Symmetry: C3
Subunit: 490 residues, 3 copies
């Protein structure tokens, strides 16, 4: 029987909503089909973007989206995705086509339709200072200039706003195989020539470490911390070796425990990378951003390996659940977190196949957990039961936020697929007595997933296996189950 | 009573004329109105440049002018200021208009009208190697090429000459927030691709330290001394803290002493920066240049802070006087010095308001002192009276040059606004007996200045309060007074 | 009497053919006249390239050619040498013309006519990442893109293949006066954006040391070894000081010994540079390339110093002979070597004067030695007689390759101009008895050369001064003589 306590009055901090962010690259079918269908697609589309999806994502409360991020960011020359759609640059190989029908206007249009924040990676590695400089002009400049006038010519009269501007991505690997010390001075130079136009205020973001490249972090903070509002981190949960990762479904119990363990490791990274930052930034001015996190499996049997099409099982849901719980645990420093990717690519929330689209297990977590977005984080501590092959992992993940409305939400994940988790919770700092509802996402299968033929195999059922004897909330979480509660006073 | 001795025969060195250089940025109204009025201005203009000013500056013996220098240099893409004036690139914002009507041809035309030397900062931070490379082609290339032919097309048949080519400016701050070690390798790279065309001979100039960034100097000398003819230094006399500098007029006696003291500090910099260079350059091949010096006050009450419009009091005159006296004291290493700025910006020599223009106190100093330009510096030493709140500052600054004509000029500044300075001078290395005239610039007010309503409040009166009894020249400088003498033998 | 032994069965390794490579820069008349005459030249030309030469070079078995290499590589913007020949960029000085009639298509056409491999230096120093990136697209990309389609538009339908891609040249001197540590990160960045298109496989080459800049080598291996397939080395045999090198003909016996000794030094370099690489690359993955080697003399009396027109004496032939023998001695690590230059420039194989062209002493060596190209290197060791003013140099250079056909070739150079070299050779690992022919290149004069008036003063005479008594081959090389043999079994 796992035990928890909650101090409903002691606010530990606030869970910045952008933590529930997402990330889309010109890759597989994340941009094309997944979102951009073109205005005269048979699919129900708003201005070229498919409705079925837009609905879901507004319903999911997306706060922010990264584009074009990843490696494409340090290849994209933004001028190839503006102007008349019929004179935009075009590239094709058969071994994979980019028409750049989706470029700058279209992205901004999208972010406004959802209502989310735009987050953009300018091209460092192959790009130029003045290139990226002008991208910012083109977008946010109110006055008269070649670039601003070109924006107008292209159909957008008044300039857009944007906060988050990533200066390159992955500059250690595909972004220019740069040494840390080197990328520092480039960032310093580039960022110098990005202006706050009109009253638009930038939030510059340096490309940070990959995994446990603490060196990278160290250097960046010493050389460049003054010139940045934030710093990126990349960590992927891969089950197996690189060359043989394992599948998204039809995996062994071994692979279960692995994936979970390897995802948890996150916390170790964030912490160690935080301690580095805490030194060079005592006052924790600088954002920690995690613009690249998620599971990663061998693509589905048959699909193009580079199209990264992978399924999304109850495993993948669990993964998300504790991850967010981790970002909660480090919400003092962390302020944004973008899953890889959004659609038809890696741990996607949505997967499509023509006009048919489904929500994954993962999607339901983001929808369920959304109530934690900008909610006040509450002091707790636990006596979590052990689980796994050697009391390896903790049986239960648990978080507690108070939203503006006063109502309080508690999220929980049974890691043990094999049996339900006994939990008792004691609840302190109360005025009124309280009522309590519940929602559980869970599966019969360890690799229970939604197909286009069965889109609702795994989805939120409301949950009632819990007694609330005003002070002790006892409950029995089902196996392999994410679960949320909502409590009102009186 | 302050005492001096002069060894008229021992020449300490020669005061390179370029020390009396100036500096104009596309900023406020330094370029526009201040100089460029357009050929079709009602103002009396020669080919777009106002006469009233040109007269004054030829009268002032300008040796060299820096353009577009400052921060604009590391933003200017020179191709935006050539070609047909009506198709040159254009920007406007009200938060400031640049039509680039003033570009490359116009500047060179100007430098030739005055008769001065041109000094240009190419764009490092936002620019490209090939960009700056071609700027040099466009200008100095005699043969047939895209760039040379484009010069011709644009109206200038034969190529211009130019010596001084600054590789960027202020690359530590606005020019690309570069570390010193970094900017070194960039300079090395860029400068590699700047050629001596026809017989035009370049004089390459690396961007040096800001104030007491001795690190910057050290690094640059070790890494790049081989590849440079000269090295830049920036020092601004600011009265107060950065955020609250103080006004140009209507200031306290506190602010008087401050400004003077802070200006003197210069000598400490030059000396320490010299000793660095003396190590890495025993034979003092490399020029020290000071392309950014002057007072700096909060702009006048009402003007745009970024238009940097500041007045020009007798304080500002004194400032210049000892500064030049300092460059004299270090003329062995120093070879050029450019005041910030020329017109309608900071410690300007000239300020305009439509067709009306006035000469500042500062202007008179440069006009008065001009006789030191390329004159032979003479050995002296002094017993200068103390002044200021704690015998802080020396009462009297003093310098002595022999011009080509054999005649000898002595410049002096009473720092004490409160009383005149007694001075006696003994005079050695003489054959013939000598005569002597004199000129004094001085004010009744501590913040005596010229307005457009009173353009002649502060200006050179000839001066006769001195007895020259063949061996001893005794004299009584007025309070807050710059003063020059001219002496012929026989 | 010099003694040698040969183990015909023990293969020491294989002499990569590319070792017999050459190198042509847009310089003097190496590209223009020397090769490119224009389709409408009176000279016998194939599609603009002179026949007389082409014939010779196919006859000489050229394996690979470097272009545009040298300093022009880090100035060439490749887009200035594609498109319609009549709209290609044009530059002229009168002190000397580049019309860029020779650009990318023409080079590839050339390499295919000869049948050789193309080796290209992209522009680092003045160029851009995306520039060089696109050059690779333009050439090797099979699909649809602006650059690939532009290739097609220009007349070449399908994309070329190319292996060897030099990332800049001479980045320590004319290529951007870079520090080693700096050029490393640039290479790393640039090379990131050069792709294997279709199935074209690149063989990237970093610019290495000049002479004995072991620092450069060290650094490059530590910083960048992972990102390179090969590394360049530059060594020039200059007789005298820089400012007075000496002439190519009419030189003293002093100058003889000098030039030889200084050329030999090569071996010391290769060895020491090898030992560096052997550390950072035990498995000798990384190629050593020597893209810049040759004699260098003051140009002929009257020609433009920068046109680098220099003659080619029996001295120059000797030089080549031992050099190749050295690359043989280090063929385990060395895989390519390009003489400077090909035509009308430095130690050229061919020199022209209108339609008249001659083959130099050097040419004959490459033609004679060609039989070593991709032949299997044989174990030997010697007791070489001493020569020179202090038993300075070894009298005899000697190498031994077995070509595919089974036949075995032995190359030899008498360094002593003054007397013939007695040699005995013992021969091991034999099955059949053997027969033997021979060819000697030699001169009566120390500075014997071919003029246009006497094109055949110095050329391959077959050679028979050797007795082969089945086991011992005794022979008397003539003075200042390169010599080859070919032996069949039975």
């Amino acid at each position: 029987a796992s035990r928890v306590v909650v101090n409903a009055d002691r606010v530990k901090g606030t869970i910045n909503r952008n933590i529930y962010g997402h990330f889309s690259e010109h890759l597989g079918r994340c941009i094309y089909e997944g979102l951009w269908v073109g205005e005269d697609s048979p699919i129900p589309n708003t201005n070229g973007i498919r409705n079925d999806v837009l609905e879901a994502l507004k319903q999911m409360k997306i706060p922010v989206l990264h584009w074009p991020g990843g490696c494409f960011a340090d290849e994209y020359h933004w001028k190839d995705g503006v102007g008349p759609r019929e004179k935009r640059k075009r590239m094709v190989n058969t071994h994979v086509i980019e028409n750049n029908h989706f470029g700058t206007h279209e992205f901004m249009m999208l972010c406004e339709l959802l209502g989310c924040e735009p987050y953009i990676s300018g091209n460092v590695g192959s790009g130029t200072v003045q290139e990226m400089s002008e991208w910012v002009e083109y977008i946010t400049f109110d006055g008269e200039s070649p670039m601003a006038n070109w924006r107008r010519e292209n159909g957008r009269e008044k300039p857009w706003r944007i906060k988050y501007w990533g200066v390159g991505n992955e500059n250690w690997f595909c972004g220019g195989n740069m040494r840390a010390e080197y990328y520092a001075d480039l960032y310093r130079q580039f960022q110098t020539y990005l202006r706050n136009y009109g009253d638009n205020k930038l939030h510059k973001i340096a490309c940070g470490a990959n995994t446990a490249d603490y060196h990278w972090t160290e250097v960046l903070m010493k050389q460049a911390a003054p010139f940045m509002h934030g710093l990126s981190l990349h960590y992927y949960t891969v089950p197996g070796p690189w060359e043989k990762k394992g599948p998204a479904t039809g995996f062994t119990t071994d692979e279960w425990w692995v994936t979970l363990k390897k995802a948890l490791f996150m916390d170790r990274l964030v912490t160690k990378h935080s301690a580095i930052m805490d030194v060079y930034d005592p006052d924790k001015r600088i954002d920690l951003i995690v613009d690249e996190w998620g599971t990663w499996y061998d693509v589905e049997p048959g699909t193009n390996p580079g199209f990264l099409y992978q399924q999304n099982s109850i495993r993948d849901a669990l993964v998300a659940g504790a991850t967010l719980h981790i970002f909660h645990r480090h919400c003092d420093r962390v302020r944004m977190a973008n899953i890889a990717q959004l659609v038809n690519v890696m741990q996607s929330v949505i997967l499509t196949e023509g006009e048919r689209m489904l929500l994954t297990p993962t999607y339901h977590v983001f929808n369920m957990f959304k109530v934690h977005q900008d909610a006040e984080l509450l002091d707790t501590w636990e006596s979590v039961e052990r689980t796994g092959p050697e009391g390896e992992l903790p049986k239960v993940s648990v978080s507690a936020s108070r939203a503006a409305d006063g109502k309080i939400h508690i999220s929980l994940c049974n890691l043990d697929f094999e049996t339900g988790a006994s939990v008792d919770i004691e609840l302190r700092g109360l005025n009124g007595g309280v009522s309590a509802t519940g929602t559980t996402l869970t599966s019969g299968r360890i690799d229970g997933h939604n197909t286009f033929d069965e889109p609702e195999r795994v989805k939120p059922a409301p949950f009632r296996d819990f007694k609330l004897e005003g002070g002790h909330l006892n409950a029995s979480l089902p196996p392999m189950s994410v679960t949320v509660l909502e409590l009102t006073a009186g």
